[model samples]
Target: ITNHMPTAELQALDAAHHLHPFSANNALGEEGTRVITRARGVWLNDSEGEEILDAMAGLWCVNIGYGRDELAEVAARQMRELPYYNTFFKTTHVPAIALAQKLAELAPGDLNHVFFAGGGSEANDTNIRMVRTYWQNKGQPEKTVIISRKNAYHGSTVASSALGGMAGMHAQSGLIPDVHHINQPNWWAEGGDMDPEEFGLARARELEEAILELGENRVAAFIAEPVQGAGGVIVAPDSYWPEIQRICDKYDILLIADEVICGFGRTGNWFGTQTMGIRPHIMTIAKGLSSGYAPIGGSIVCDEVAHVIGKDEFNHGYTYSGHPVAAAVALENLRILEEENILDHVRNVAAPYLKEKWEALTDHPLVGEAKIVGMMASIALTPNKASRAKFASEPGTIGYICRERCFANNLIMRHVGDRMIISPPLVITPAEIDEMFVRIRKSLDEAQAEIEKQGLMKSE
Candidate 1:
């Protein structure tokens, strides 16, 4: 089909046929969906030809932004030469081998092995089995439970979704067995009167509490996103990770870092684990691995975990695991990141610039808290900044209003409950960052007016 299709016609067709994920189906059908025709840099051109700045970086994956001819060229070449090949059995291919080697060199500590997947969800599913099997191989079959933080997002597959602690997802899917949740380290919303450092430590200790209660022998692993990307970009306190690390070490359990959103160059480091000072037994990766140029993801395992898992037959994998085309594109993406110094730019340039402007949003009356780290950030919308109060209306009322304003302004910022988050492409420049902030301020102003006008700005 040509890209020249009319906007209304495309929306009509989409409404008839497309079933979107995490959307109100009937409402969306009535309203119709916006059709994105193409994108370049941080800009998305929809069917109506409106250029929207994608602040969420294509769902927090497009670290390299969009429209890189080099990636397209490499993908086309790889497809022609070898489109698909599985890494199952004893069979292996150059693209897979080379990419694995590249990952090993780049990952932190002794994380020297790779297990490929089609995306983050599959890699996390791989993780659940692999970690369990490793414990079972060591004659500890009772080590079956995995602890995760409440509101964290690992992925959407049965096992991965279970690993996550979103109440909504759990309510809909009925969580799988043996996955337990501890409260997250989101001090802003949930800390009450506790100091952030004190609260962080208290929350981290919950892992130990849960382990002791569940019997350490039954707790196989603990998994979390370093920065809690989908959990409203919640950046844990400085005291949080150290205590969590201490607990995991003392408990003799595996720790898995879900790096799908935080990996590659998004965090201003090679991996979020590095930026957050975490040393995980396994790192679940996707998204930036190919910069959304191709679908690919995997777990980079520590030497010990890999060694243990390698001892058994380990009968688990996907058909598209280590597909040649995906691997080749990921390799090219990595090369571009390294050669172009994208991480350096993120660390030294974009992150600092965006942080200044983003944090400044706190001056707006509707914004209670503005938090950012590296290329990802978020603002909490509230009616009372002093108390960090929730709106008297429904949880997401103001956020939805703000998101609608952003859409009207052609800035693709996203709302998670009452928080508006941004993960602009790492390639965004200071000038673009400034402009994005200008758009953000405008949207926030409009949203404030609309919410106040609607009598939805009461603090409770």
Candidate 2:
């Protein structure tokens, strides 16, 4: 019933029933959807039987790649043993307890407590209430604001969306109160004449300025993704994190590192906090925690925060906070990560090779700068590289055209404004990385030709 249907018929059914996230449904319906039937390793088989290279790794979550039988087996075994159980009311299951223990051990510093959720968004929502509750318990109820970076991508829930700094999401969701935003350290776009290190320091000091302006007693925490995943995979300069860390420590502001996209070996480390050298009090996790085999996420809290919060009933939890099946699948996924030496493969082979090929994208005329950190990478599309100029056309116009060219070439690189981004599975081989670049170069060539034809090569 599922695999046998015609592509057009399936597309029609999907258009009729499925309302996709972050999409204009009517326009998408008119354009028709590409139905993905199956995936294995780093490749996806669409309904049309085209073998498309998935450079985005299923929205940057499928870290271990696809088609692992062990995760499935573990899930089935756990489901049969204890299919449904809640962690509420002072009762817990083995999968939940074991997964929490494993997370505590894997997490750094004094982050010895875990609060589970169904996914990253729910986990971040939990963070909001948990941090506020911790402050209230500590007799600092006035410290309520959570300072975040502009253009960051946390998640899509009402609270999580409010916590994120994407202007478009804030426009639609109409941000919740007590969330302040500051400039990001995007040297290429907003740095102007300053050097990258200088710009990074200036941006980091914005947090200090914000704290002073808002009053330190009124600021509770500062939340940010280590690499700013959905915000064009923006990696800050080396000076950034250290200064930010110092500011947070000096102000006594709790540091919350949102690791939803950067966790579980995406950035050559177990967590992005380690790679970026930031000591966080609370780290929000999800996505690669289970390699997207099942939905699960949580917050790893430091001992002090956990101790304060544990003093009374915090009054926050999701129904699937620690589903046995999900926890078992996540455990199995973690096993594969450790047992197979996946991080070694990424550090010694995949990331180095990918970084080399990725940075070479700048040789293309349309590419201005290419930035890569471990598996996550991005290229800025510009009409004039010298000036790092934006296109004379509207924002994202060039990126959309290039993205379509990539789709036509059977690749899955994504467009964020005028930036093209990729986060392939950690298991992708050097040969696969080479193939991805081939398609990327071709797509860039075709996009360049189209841009010239449309007279869009002029700088804004």
Candidate 3:
């Protein structure tokens, strides 16, 4: 149906029924959706025959890029052999077992156990239950509070959204109880009157303060993205994670690393936890786990936590937990990531080149700060860089304009509020990276012109 339908017709159909996530429904309905027909490598072919450079890598997945035939073949092979099965009630399939084993091997430290889910959100929900359950099993059910950073993006489900610090999501449906948020170590946006290193220590110490305020026994875990991905790819300072690790250890609270966007070569390592030099008790895995080829995610559990959780019935799981097909696809994705030496390419080749070009964006009049780690990066657009100034207009207004301009320029850099972020496919070549940056610079130029014309150069 997608292949046969015209772009206009498809847009009409989508507007009639489909509800896009994190979108203004009325605005999108009026404008119509961009219908993407297919993709190959790092390029997306839209229904209108436009070739787009997917800089965001299809929502920061697709690390290996699109059109990997091996994944499809594995999915088919698994479906024919065992289309479905329950990991519950003392029953499991070969795909689930093998995939879990593979994850254990790839994951760092004694994060040797896996709990499968449908995706990142589901995996985060699982984390909530698992962490809380771990405490419950340890005879301290009161230790239920989970601490996270402001502007962190864990997931969008009820628990996961609550676990996240996005006020918008919290305002929509309210957050779960016992989930507290501390300020993020976003030096560019939030740091004032202090150096970045000092600001990072200040922000990291917020967790310790929160834990102290909540009382050590009442805190269950501290959850964070090593680099906040959806939160404008905000990279923590060098001083941050070490302080966080110390506090978590001192408090004896579990550490949950939301690696959904940072795993599978995205961070120039198998996991962001490794890159950041922090050890977590439970690591949330998704996105590149299946490279957006199939829905699959899980929690890589440390030995100690796994032991407690295994002692009794977990009493929590999804029907699609470790679904044979998703697992098979994820396994194939991992195979491609490893056997093809994609991590090496990201560490030694793509990242360094992209970082150089990406950092050069700071030279633009509108760009204030450029921060990057491996494949993910973001540049803040500002009216006054000296002040690190925000636009006088409402948040996201300038960003939305820039986003539209990027779309017009056939690039896929996403706007996180007023910040432009990118997580291009790890497999993107130096030439492709150069092409993407050219388009990005053009979009920025267009946006700058439009903003200036509209007299939107004032800071809030």
Candidate 4:
């Protein structure tokens, strides 16, 4: 990889102008930026010609991998046909209708209605409104409280951000309203001494606790990801989803699966809910919806909910809610995904291969547990792997060090708190998986050495 002036200039300009979300601007300015100029398949080419393995897959989107010109061609044709349009009012478009039908067809069970949005946040925001309005239609307007869980991330919009369990997002926005949260199904941290299945049931029972405390009649819905992705790829224990579904069914609360990170074959299934066997009533989808071709997302409502919501004039929609170009790209992206049999490939090939090597990390001195499912996994950094103990080091310092070392090593592994996670493109090859594992191992070894140096990884 050769260093170049253009990359440095771009980094400087980005530092000055980019108002990136989920980032500290001043901190970014201090640390500078590593600029990626292009990507092909699973590798991103930085401006200096360094090829970095895109293990995080562009923030856990990019299921089709980069340089899929088929999507590009569709986008170009769509732009020529109709670049953009609003689906507000009664006006409709072909791409919107077609994409919605495709999604409904592909979506499990009776999830047959699609309400479009510009992105995941807006889609989850739509969920906030739609779920409430559905209860309203059910003659339960008082049932407006949405239950989420701690450390989960739905999105960044006002209502959805509130609905999300991320206190970090909520702390600045002052968004504690309407949305109530129960304990997360984080059996790893929350369920100590208790076996995972037992812990899963106990943690899941928190929903019952919430509903019982809040009064089931007052709670409209419960939302969660099949796997908590942005919350460091927190894989739920096998028993978690069934218990959640039972609770939701028992209480008549709409189950909203926020598939923003786990949708479109990233999780070795068409939807993560399938992998986890969750029968959600409504689903909020985005990210891989269009394979990052053009920004798009949507709420897939149950037929019953959509029927009631659409029967009357519900006031909602963005100007570009099913923007023609975005819809076409999304439709085309899904077509490519299915045609290529990427989902099956993920399940049969990448997943098992990944597990064989990925879980092998637990043998390393630093890893506490290798949290994984499908193409996603994370390593928890702790002072004691056997006891899962933490030390005096600040929460995310070691993970940050690992992240930086990964970047320096030309690998794109990322972190959340002290957990390092990866959700690469569904199209990643066995060789790429090996390469990814190598980088992860390097990061683990380096991170452990660094932590030991900082006195963070003290032995028992």
- The TM-scores of all predictions, comma-separated, are 0.99, 0.99, 0.99, 0.97
For residues 285-372, what per-residue lDDT tens digits would candidate 1 score against the true structure? 9999999888999999999989988886999999999999999999999999999999889888898888888888888988888998
- lDDT at 323, model 3: 96
> Which residue pairs show backbone clashes in model 1?
none
Q: Candidate 3: minimum summed lDDT over ten consecutive residues — where?
A: 1-10
Highest lDDT model number: 2
| Residue pairs with backbone overlap in model 4 | none
**lDDT ranking, high to low:** 2, 3, 1, 4
Backbone steric clashes in candidate 4, count = 0
lDDT against the true structure, per candidate, is: 0.91, 0.93, 0.92, 0.85
Per-residue error for 13 in candidate 1, Å, reads 1.0
In model 1, the Cα lDDT at residue 99 comes to 99
Q: Give stretches of model 2 more than 4 Å off.
A: none
Comparing 1 with 2 on lDDT, the higher-scoring candidate is: 2
Cα RMSD for candidates in order: 0.9, 0.8, 0.9, 2.0
Residue pairs in candidate 3 whose N, alpha carbon or C atoms collide under 3 angstroms: none
Model 4 regions more than 4 Å off: 1-5, 174-176, 458-460
- In candidate 1, stretches whose alpha carbon ends up further than 4 angstroms from where it belongs are none
Q: How close is candidate 1 to the true structure, as a TM-score?
A: 0.99
Q: After superposition, how far is residue 195 of candidate 3 from its true place, in Å?
A: 0.5
For model 3, give the RMSD to the true fold. Answer: 0.9
Model 4 Cα lDDT, one tens digit per residue, 195-312:
9999888888889999989998898888999999888888878888899888877777889999999899878888988888888888889999988878999988888898989778
